[model samples]
Target: MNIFEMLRIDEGLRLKIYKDTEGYYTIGIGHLLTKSPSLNAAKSELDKAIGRNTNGVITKDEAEKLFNQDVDAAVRGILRNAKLKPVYDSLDAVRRAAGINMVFQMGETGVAGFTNSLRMLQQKRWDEAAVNLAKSRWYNQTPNRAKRVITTFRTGTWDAYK
Candidate 1:
């Protein structure tokens, strides 16, 4: 699957505003509303993206636009990370997509903290790389998403995109 398809399957979608597991106000393909500079700023971004002054609602097309930008940012951010550059470059497309997915969920800084995991990935120790991921708090926190990415990493295939 492509990165877009991978993310759509993993991130899901929400038209109505709601709180995510961490209790942050969020909407539309895992977009974290709380990350905005202010509440008004967040709402305004939501409205602008959805092309309507909404009471915390969004359309799938609008959500796709938001997701496109966010996913691109994650892609660029991970590619820009010097510490992860070699590791990212060393992987097959599917494994790279898995890395990009992880970077999408957790930012460059967050994924950079996975030193051992990245090391194993760089060394082409697929199982060890996946095992390192399973050892993290990230795995415990988001087991399903983490597991799919882990599977991709180990197998170097997109079968986990479902």
Candidate 2:
């Protein structure tokens, strides 16, 4: 998957976009990126981009674009360096509270379901995924779908079964 797809799949990570007056797009990596030591350098770069992008005519879109680029760079940078493994791993704990919600509003329960499940899987907390999936139904009122996912979780259909 591409960066945007990866960002979407990893519901633990959030990406916010900013558009300039000229309609340029920049993205931010949210709080998830800040929790990494290795990401410090990329975060600095993002800060510079944000400063430049927001200096005068920076619209919300521009800021978002800058954030997106920074997040992409930070993630790539972390993956390339073995010493940065911890930072990369910590990202799995980052919750995607911002952009991911838009998907839920579109009536596409699958994205929400998969994202919630994926976060649980990534954290290596299968039981939590099961529990959270059930909770997603409570919040979304799609208990049938939630039950199906839970059943899968119980049947060890998910590779990360506890």
Candidate 3:
């Protein structure tokens, strides 16, 4: 009934690596095995296991461990960037969480591409930053998600789903 439980139901528990609908290599509850070093390590382990006639599977607990590790790294990157600017520390918890979520979805480098938005944030221009976020290609590609982030940026509140 909690968020993780709902996500577990939605993502489904896949012990074995498989191609997702988009053809990306994935495993363990929709964990994208992409260019990330941690994912690459998991992929290597899966490959080795498969070569030995095993299913290249992981336990549910192991999957959760991997997910936590990946999330921790992503959050660390967000925190490191936040530390560089006093404006980041000035934001409320919801706004900070929104920023962290953006970093998680886009990666630090991708989020850094929002130069104007970052500047607006640095200047405490919440409305301007929200507008800049709405003007982005990322926003165009996922308006629902963009709206949530934009709302948080402007109001300093969580409103992604509501």
Candidate 4:
């Protein structure tokens, strides 16, 4: 019931490359291999981690490495953002995982844009925060996953098992 467990379930591991909802080249557990950070950096990193496979396929272990890197990157971004860091620190681990999930999908600036929702989260107004999240482009794009994150915000639990 850790962060990875939730992310693993939510993102799902893919050994082959595929286009995401936004149609970016993604691989592993939701790693945007060639969009956010640019394709050059992604391949450079991949070359180091998994020898840069030519066939768009990666091993489970290789994918795990990418997942770890991306997750760390997301966490780091959240921590570095002035607007997000305080809210992240105020949250419990489960809630923090939810925050990470948010930042993972939308980036730190995107999460920071949730002014009312972050205020609600800081005040522990769970339902209010959930409601705000439901009314977002993130929700519009990935409704089911957004719903799980909303549930987590409301109940302070992992978005797995029921």
lDDT of 3 by residue, 90-157 (tens): 66676766666566456678655677787788777998888888887778876766676678778875
Tell me the deviation in Å of residue 95 in model 3: 0.7
TM-score between model 3 and native: 0.66
lDDT of 4 by residue, 82-127 (tens): 8888899999988899889888887766654699899999999998
TM-score (all chains, Cα) for each model: 0.88, 0.26, 0.66, 0.87
* Of 3 and 4, the candidate ranking higher by lDDT: 4
Give residue 132's error in model 1 in angstroms. 0.9
Ten-residue segment with the worst summed lDDT in candidate 2? 93-102
Model 1: how far is 85 from its true place, Å? Answer: 1.8
Compared with the true structure, the alpha-carbon lDDT of candidate 3 equals 0.64
For all predictions, the C-alpha RMSD in Å is 2.2, 12.9, 5.1, 2.8
Report the candidate with higher TM-score, 1 versus 3: 1
| lDDT: worst 10-residue window of model 3 | 1-10
- For residues 33-115, what per-residue lDDT tens digits would candidate 1 score against the true structure? 77644667778767776778887877888778888899888878877888888888988888889888888776777765698
Which sections of candidate 2 miss by over 4 Å?
1-57, 83-125, 128-162
> Candidate 4 — which residues are off by over 4 angstroms?
36-49, 159-161
* Model 2 per-residue lDDT tens digits across residues 1-162: 233443334322324433322233323323222323343444454556656532223354654565466455555554554543332354322222211222322223355345655556556575786676666534355444345335444343432211
Per-residue error (Å), model 4, residue 92: 1.2
